[PDB]
Amino acid sequence: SMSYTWTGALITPCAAEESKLPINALSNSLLRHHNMVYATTSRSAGLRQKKVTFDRLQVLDDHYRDVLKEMKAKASTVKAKLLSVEEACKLTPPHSAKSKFGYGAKDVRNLSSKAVNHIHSVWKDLLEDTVTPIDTTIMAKNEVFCVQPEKGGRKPARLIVFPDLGVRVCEKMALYDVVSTLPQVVMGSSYGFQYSPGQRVEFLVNTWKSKKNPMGFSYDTRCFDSTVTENDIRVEESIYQCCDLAPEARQAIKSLTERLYIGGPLTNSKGQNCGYRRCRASGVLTTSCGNTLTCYLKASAACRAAKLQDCTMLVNGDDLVVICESAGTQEDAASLRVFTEAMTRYSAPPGDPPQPEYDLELITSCSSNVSVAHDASGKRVYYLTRDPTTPLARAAWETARHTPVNSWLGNIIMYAPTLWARMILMTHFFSILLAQEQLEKALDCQIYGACYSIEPLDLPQIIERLHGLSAFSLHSYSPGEINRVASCLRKLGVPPLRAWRHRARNVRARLLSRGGRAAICGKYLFNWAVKTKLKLTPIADLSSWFTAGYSGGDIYH
Ligand SMILES: *[C@H](c1ccc(Br)cc1)[C@H]1SC(=S)N(NS(=O)(=O)c2ccccc2)C1=O
C-alpha cells in the first residue's frame, strides 16, 4: 500500500521558524562561515513528502518466517508490567507538547486532576475501542546542518508524526516496560542500545577480531519509517503479545497497534486534514523498539538468504552494520547484492547500495566509526568518533540561540575521547560557561532518544565512568582521523587546533582557580593542553543511560 496519501493541505509550522545562523560574536569565534549553517523548516516539507511517499510491495519467505519464529520464542520468556498513571506521568518531559484538551506537560507531571482524568478516559477508550483510528499531528522537524555542495542541495525537513499527550501517557503505561526490556532479550548482543560508546567499540572490535577474514558493511535503508508496512507493525505486535502481560496491557497494546501504530489520519498544526499514514509514525513510544526489531528481523533473514558466513550484526533502529567472514572480493560483492535483493523483497530497499569494507575504521554505522589512539603509556586504545561537521554546526547554532536541547553536551559525553570534542567543544563551551557564570546550570540533552538533565561540572566523573581515565590522556590519533578533523575545520572556518590549545590553557587556569568540580574539570578535561601534565587519578550509576532506545518516544529521565 502507499506509505502516505495526501489531501493537499500543507504541513504547517506552529511557531516562527529560524533558518539561518545569526551573526553572533560567540558563535563567530567557533565557526566563521555562518552562511553554511542552516535549520530545516516546514518550507521544504513538500520535498520530504515526495520522497517518503511510495507503494510498498512486501513479499515474505521462509528465511523471514524462521527468524520471526526464533524471535517470538525469545519474547515468550519476557514478563512485562503496566505502569501506573503516576509512573507514566513522571516520564513525561517538562516541555512536551500540551494536549488539545486543555492541559499540558506541566499538568501531567504535577498530576493535576484534569490531566489524570483525561488520561483515565483515554485509557478506557483504548480498552473499549480497538478500531477507530487515533488522530496524530504531522509537523516538520527543525534540525541543524552544514551545507554540502557535493550533495547538490540542502536537506529537506524530516517529518514527525505524534498523537495527543493523553495517548502518549497511555503508551507509556501499556508499553514502557516492554520497549525497555524486550529488545535486548529478543536480539541479544545485536541490540545496540544496551551499549555505552565504549562497549559499542568493544563489541565491534571483538567481533571483527573473531573473524578469520573479516568483512563488514552498513546497510542504509531508504526512508526506513516509510518502508515499514502495516504487516510489519502487526508482526511487531505479535512479538509484544508473546510476553507475559496483564489482560489490560494486552488489550491496550492491541488497541494502540490497530488504532495508532498501523496508521491513521494526519492533521497539520492548523487543524486541517493532511492525509493518511500506513507506515511507521516517527513520534510514538514504539518507534525505536519497533524499528530495531523490524530491521533486525529483515537483516537476519537477508543474511541467510545471501548465505553470509558467520554473521554478526549490530542494530540501532534503522542503523545496521554486519560483520562476517569474507569469501573473496568478487564473491562478497555478489553476496551483498543478494542481501540487498532480500531486504528489497522484505520492503526495505537501499538508499546507497551496501559496500564490502575490509578495514574496520572505514565502516560508518549510526554516523560513527571506530578509530585508534594511544594512552599515556603508549598502549593502543580504540574509541568511537565521527565526522565533526554536524556536531560543530549544531554547537555554533546553540551558542547563538538558546535551545531546549543542548546537542553539544551530548556530543562531549558520547565523543569525549575524540580530539575534536576535547580541543574544540570542551574549550569553547567552558569558556562561555565561565563568562556567564553558568558552570552550575543544569542542561537537558538527549541520549538514545531519552532526555536527561546534566550538569557540565559533572563531565569529568561522567566521562571517566563511561570511557575510563584514558579519555583524558589519549594522544597520537590516527592520520585518517586527524585529516578528517583538519578538513572539516577549513570548510567551516573553525580556528585551527593550535589556536584551541592556547584558548584551553586560559580556560584551564580559570577553572583551577575555582572551587570543587570546576578545578577537577580544569585538571582532567584540559591536561592535554599542558606539557607539564598533572596526575590523573580516579576521580573521588549511568547504566540506565544505555539500556534501550527511545527516539521519538517522549521520554524524560
Ligand atoms: C547512532 C549512534 C551513534 C553513537 C552510538 Br554509541 C550509538 C548510536 C544514532 S542512534 C541514536 S538514538 N543516536 N543519538 S545518541 O543520543 O545516541 C548520541 C548523541 C550524541 C552523540 C552520539 C550519540 C545516534 O547518534
Tell me if 177 is assigned to a ligand binding site: no
CA dihedral 28, 30, 32, 33 (to 10 degrees): -120
Distances (CA, A) of 493 to 129, 150, 297, 490: 57, 18, 44, 5
Q: Are 511 and 430 in contact (CB under 8 A)?
A: yes
What's the full length of the chain, in residues? 557
Q: Nearest C-alpha to atom 12 of ligand 1 is from which residue?
A: 448
Q: Residue 515 and residue 527: Cα distance in Å, rounded?
A: 18
Q: Are 552 and 282 in contact (CB under 8 A)?
A: yes
C-alpha torsion sign, points 388, 282, 175, 343: negative
Ligand 1 pocket test, candidate residues 318, 366, 382, most atoms within 8 A of CB: 366
Q: Residue 493 and residue 55: Cα distance in Å, rounded?
A: 43
The Cβ-side half-sphere exposure at 239, using a 13 Å CA radius, reads: 32
Q: Residue 251 and residue 247: Cα distance in Å, rounded?
A: 6
Q: What φ, ψ does residue 333 adopt, rounded to 5°?
A: -60, -40
Atom of ligand 1 nearest to the CA of 549: 12
Query: Could you tell me which of 477, 402, 414 has the C-alpha nearest to residue 443?
Result: 402
C-alpha torsion sign, points 362, 365, 367, 370: negative
Helix 62-75 × helix 165-187 angle, to 10° = 100
Strands (E), 168-263: 214-219
Helix, strand, coil share (%) of the chain residues, nearest 5: 50, 15, 35
Query: Could you tell me which of 514, 498, 400 has the C-alpha nearest to residue 456?
Result: 514
- As beta bridge partners, residue 368 has 365
Tell me if 318 is assigned to a ligand binding site: yes
Query: Could you tell me which of 293, 296, 294 has the C-alpha nearest to residue 320?
Result: 296
Q: Which residue has the cell 575524540?
A: 418
Helix (H) or strand (E) holding 418: none
Q: Residue 269 and residue 4: Cα distance in Å, rounded?
A: 18
The three state secondary structure string of 475-514 is ECCCHHHHHHHHHHHHHHCCCCHHHHHHHHHHHHHHHHCC
- As beta bridge partners, residue 221 has 350
**Beta strands 273-277 and 4-6: pairing type?**
antiparallel
Q: Residue 142 and residue 13: Cα distance in Å, rounded?
A: 10
Q: Residue 262 and residue 281: Cα distance in Å, rounded?
A: 8
Question: Position 66: which residue type?
Answer: D
Residue 330 Cα to ligand 1 middle (Å): 33
Q: How far is CA 57 from the centre of its chain?
A: 28
Strands (E), 236-317: 264-267, 273-277, 309-316
Residue 510 Cα to ligand 1 middle (Å): 32
Q: Are 429 and 510 in contact (CB under 8 A)?
A: no
The Cβ-side half-sphere exposure at 501, using a 13 Å CA radius, reads: 8
Query: Could you tell me which of 138, 155, 156 has the C-alpha nearest to residue 284?
Result: 138
Q: Residue 309 and residue 313: Cα distance in Å, rounded?
A: 12
Q: How far is CA 287 from the centre of its chain?
A: 11
Q: What φ, ψ does residue 551 adopt, rounded to 5°?
A: -50, 125
Distances (CA, A) of 64 to 61, 237, 301: 5, 16, 5
**Beta strands 264-267 and 369-374: pairing type?**
unpaired
Atom of ligand 1 nearest to the CA of 200: 6
Strand 319-325: give its sheet, edge to edge.
Answer: 214-219, 319-325, 309-316
**Beta strands 4-6 and 380-385: pairing type?**
unpaired
Q: Nearest C-alpha to atom 23 of ligand 1 is from which residue?
A: 414
Residue 79 Cα to ligand 1 middle (Å): 28
State the cell numbers at 87: 509512573
Radius of gyration of the chain (CA): 24
Residue 541 CB neighbour total at 10 angstroms? 5
Q: Burial code of 90-126, b = ≥16 C-beta within 10 A, e = fewer?
A: ebbbeebbebeeebbbebbbeeeeebbebbeebbebb
Atom of ligand 1 nearest to the CA of 446: 16
Which CATH number is associated with domain 192-228+286-368?
3.30.70.270
Q: Which residue has the cell 512486501?
A: 58
Tell me if 220 is assigned to a ligand binding site: yes
Q: How was this structure determined?
A: X-ray
Q: Residue 43 and residue 184: Cα distance in Å, rounded?
A: 39
Question: Position 198: which residue type?
Answer: G
Ligand 1 pocket test, candidate residues 195, 368, 385, most atoms within 8 A of CB: 368
Q: Are 489 and 496 in contact (CB under 8 A)?
A: yes
SS3 at position 548: coil
Q: Nearest C-alpha to atom 3 of ligand 1 is from which residue?
A: 366
Strands (E), 299-358: 309-316, 319-325
- As beta bridge partners, residue 325 has 214, 309
Residues with CB under 6 A from ligand 1: 197, 200, 316, 319, 366-368, 384, 410-411, 414-415, 446-449, 549, 551
Q: Counting runs of H as helices and runs of E as strands, what totals does the chain give?
A: 21, 14
Q: Residue 54 and residue 496: Cα distance in Å, rounded?
A: 46
Helix (H) or strand (E) holding 102: none
Distances (CA, A) of 167 to 101, 219, 460, 490: 12, 33, 39, 47
**Beta strands 144-146 and 37-39: pairing type?**
antiparallel
Resolution (A): 2.2
Q: Where are the domains of the chain?
A: 1-55+133-163+263-278, 56-132+164-191+229-262+279-285, 192-228+286-368, 369-557
